[PDB]
Design a binder for this molecule. Structure first.
Ligand SMILES: O=c1[nH]c2cc(C(F)(F)F)c(N3CCOCC3)cc2n(CP(=O)(O)O)c1=O
Ligand SMILES: O=c1[nH]c2cc(C(F)(F)F)c(N3CCOCC3)cc2n(CP(=O)(O)O)c1=O
Lengths: 49, 49, 49, 49, 50, 49
């Protein structure tokens, strides 16, 4: 009973990623952009930490 | 070599100084793509979990 | 305050504010270049945050 | 187990998500300002929604 | 598009936008911009988007 | 009576016919304002919720 309660407690845990701060808060799910372009130049010339 | 261009070209400062642009018809931003996980819940196999 | 409302859903139409100048003015093109320079540097996003 | 799961997290969600949700129901009413171009957008619209 | 296995999450991160390209000092640029504003206020851009 | 207007004035076609406008610094649209969904008294429906 306690174990199934723990599994259903895990079932209602943290929602999927909805912001860039959610990407910065984790490290398990990696991510990438295109190798060339102004999209990568946005992050290269960014000022927000 | 051309007279007018109707194409998705990004309006930037470095491109305004050589050619002109009208008002933007479609605004957009940088997006996030995920794997979109579904609710793949099996039957009898999930009972003995 | 009282932090009791929230916004859902995407934008329904394409709206946008811009700097207004009278027709036949001399400062409109440097104002537009300054707006593009502030847009590319992300300072507008900094002031929005 | 599931009653413990509901009493554990208690993360309620919003009933209305998109703009089509307003057309999908009629119990929760919705309105705009009495005058303005926002109302003119609904007055001169071409979408059946 | 098929296999319909992706989804878009989050809001836009920057203010990007595409426009009609014309050379500098062109005579047709102002009627082209008037036509773009007329198509934007008519909502026909959203019709073609749908 | 003025030289330049730096204010949230809506870019329309009828305002383009008399004065000029620059590129948009901030795009926006029509959104949905609802209150934050707080806890509501469930009642008899909690017998088999
Ligand atoms: O002027 C530019 N206009 C661009 C227009 C588009 C499109 F969306 F297709 F219109 C794209 N893509 C986005 C993703 O799918 C592949 C192509 C890239 C563009 N790039 C390259 P950037 O430098 O990385 O932005 C430009 O330079
Ligand atoms: O040029 C215009 N600029 C406007 C700017 C604003 C804002 F910047 F948000 F203050 C607003 N508001 C909408 C939200 O609540 C407060 C007032 C209305 C504007 N209207 C009237 P519309 O025709 O109904 O859009 C214009 O005409």
């Amino acid at each position: 009973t306690a174990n199934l309660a723990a599994f259903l407690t895990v079932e209602r845990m943290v929602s999927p990623i909805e912001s860039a701060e959610d990407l910065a808060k984790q490290t398990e799910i990696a991510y990438g952009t295109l190798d060339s372009g102004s999209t990568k130049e946005f992050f290269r010339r960014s000022k927000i930490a | 070599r051309a007279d007018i261009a109707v194409a998705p070209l990004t309006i930037t400062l470095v491109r305004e100084e050589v050619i002109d642009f009208s008002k933007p018809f479609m605004s957009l931003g940088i997006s996030i793509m995920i794997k979109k996980p579904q609710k793949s819940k099996p039957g009898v196999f999930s009972f003995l979990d | 305050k009282p932090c009791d409302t929230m916004k859902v859903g995407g934008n329904l139409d394409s709206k946008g504010y811009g700097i207004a100048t009278p027709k036949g003015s001399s400062l409109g093109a440097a104002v537009n270049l300054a707006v593009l320079k502030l847009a590319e540097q992300g300072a507008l996003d900094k002031l929005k945050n | 187990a599931n009653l413990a799961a509901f009493l554990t997290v208690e993360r309620m969600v919003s009933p209305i998500e998109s703009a089509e949700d307003l057309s999908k129901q009629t119990e929760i009413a919705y309105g705009t300002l009495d005058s303005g171009s926002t109302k003119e957008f609904f007055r001169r619209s071409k979408i059946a929604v | 598009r098929k296999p319909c296995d992706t989804m878009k999450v989050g809001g836009n991160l920057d203010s990007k936008g595409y426009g009609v390209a014309t050379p500098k000092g062109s005579a047709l640029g102002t009627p082209v911009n008037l036509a773009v504003l007329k198509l934007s206020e008519q909502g026909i851009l959203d019709k073609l988007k749908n | 009576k003025a030289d330049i207007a730096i204010a949230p004035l809506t870019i329309t076609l009828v305002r383009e016919e008399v004065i000029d406008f620059s590129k948009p610094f901030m795009s926006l649209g029509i959104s949905i304002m609802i209150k934050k969904p707080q806890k509501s008294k469930p009642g008899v429906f909690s017998f088999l919720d």
